[PDB]
């Protein structure tokens, strides 16, 4: 599923991602925009043979099981395919763990490079939330 911007905002907020670990909703929406273009089915292979999945491009190196990342972990205890669903619950729950790992949203390189230090509230402006 490809979310609309405000649609994704509302879903993230309902799942309690807004202000989670101090990161306002626009941070999460902006991360999703640049990681996936709001597309839950997004997948991308990394150099190391791991793959990133879903609206927040969660990496199989550490966080989910895809059956083909030898030596990886599965810290969210989920198949990576759960992260591609139209329902973002699994992605949100796993993102909460990732953002709590110590480096905050710097875990998402696209957040650091495209969202951090910008007017991230722009990503939720206009939305009725």
From Swiss-Prot:
Q: Which coarse location class describes where this protein primarily resides?
A: secreted
Q: Does the keyword Calcium apply?
A: no
InterPro entries in the cross-refs: Glyco_hydro_22, Glyco_hydro_22_CS, Glyco_hydro_22_lys, Lysozyme-like_dom_sf
Chain ranges passing through the membrane: none
What pairs make up the disulfide bonds? Answer: 6-127, 30-115, 64-80, 76-94
Q: Where in the cell is it found?
A: Secreted
Question: GO MF terms on file?
Answer: beta-N-acetylglucosaminidase activity; identical protein binding; lysozyme activity
**C-type lysozyme domain boundaries:** 1-129
Example GO biological process term? Answer: defense response to Gram-negative bacterium
* UniProt-listed Enzyme Commission number(s): 3.2.1.17
Task: Enumerate the active-site residues.
Answer: 35, 52
User: Which tissues show it?
Assistant: In the egg white and polymorphonuclear leukocytes.
| SUPFAM superfamilies associated with the record | Lysozyme-like (SSF53955)
What keywords is this UniProt entry annotated with? Allergen, Antimicrobial, Bacteriolytic enzyme, Disulfide bond, Glycosidase, Hydrolase, Secreted, Signal
Task: Please verify whether the record's keywords include Hydrolase.
Answer: yes
**Amino-acid positions noted as binding substrate in the UniProt annotation, renumbered to this chain:** 101
- PROSITE patterns given in the database record: GLYCOSYL_HYDROL_F22_1, GLYCOSYL_HYDROL_F22_2
Q: What does this protein do?
A: Lysozymes have primarily a bacteriolytic function; those in tissues and body fluids are associated with the monocyte-macrophage system and enhance the activity of immunoagents. Has bacteriolytic activity against M.luteus.
Miscellaneous note, as given in the UniProt record, is: Lysozyme C is capable of both hydrolysis and transglycosylation; it also shows a slight esterase activity. It acts rapidly on both peptide-substituted and unsubstituted peptidoglycan, and slowly on chitin oligosaccharides.
Task: Name the protein family.
Answer: Belongs to the glycosyl hydrolase 22 family.
Protein name (database record): Lysozyme C
Q: Which organism is it from?
A: Gallus gallus (Chicken)
């Amino acid at each position: 599923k490809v979310f609309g911007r405000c649609e994704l905002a509302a879903a993230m907020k309902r799942h309690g991602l807004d202000n989670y670990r101090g990161y306002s909703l626009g941070n999460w929406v902006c991360a999703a925009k640049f990681e996936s273009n709001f597309n839950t089915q997004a997948t991308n292979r990394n150099t190391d043979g791991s793959t990133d999945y879903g609206i927040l491009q969660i990496n199989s190196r550490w966080w989910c099981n895809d059956g083909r990342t030898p030596g990886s972990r599965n810290l969210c205890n989920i198949p990576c395919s759960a992260l591609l669903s139209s329902d973002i619950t699994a992605s949100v729950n796993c993102a909460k763990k990732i953002v709590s790992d110590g480096n905050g949203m710097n875990a998402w390189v696209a957040w650091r490079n495209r969202c951090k230090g910008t007017d991230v509230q722009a990503w939720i402006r206009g939305c009725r939330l």
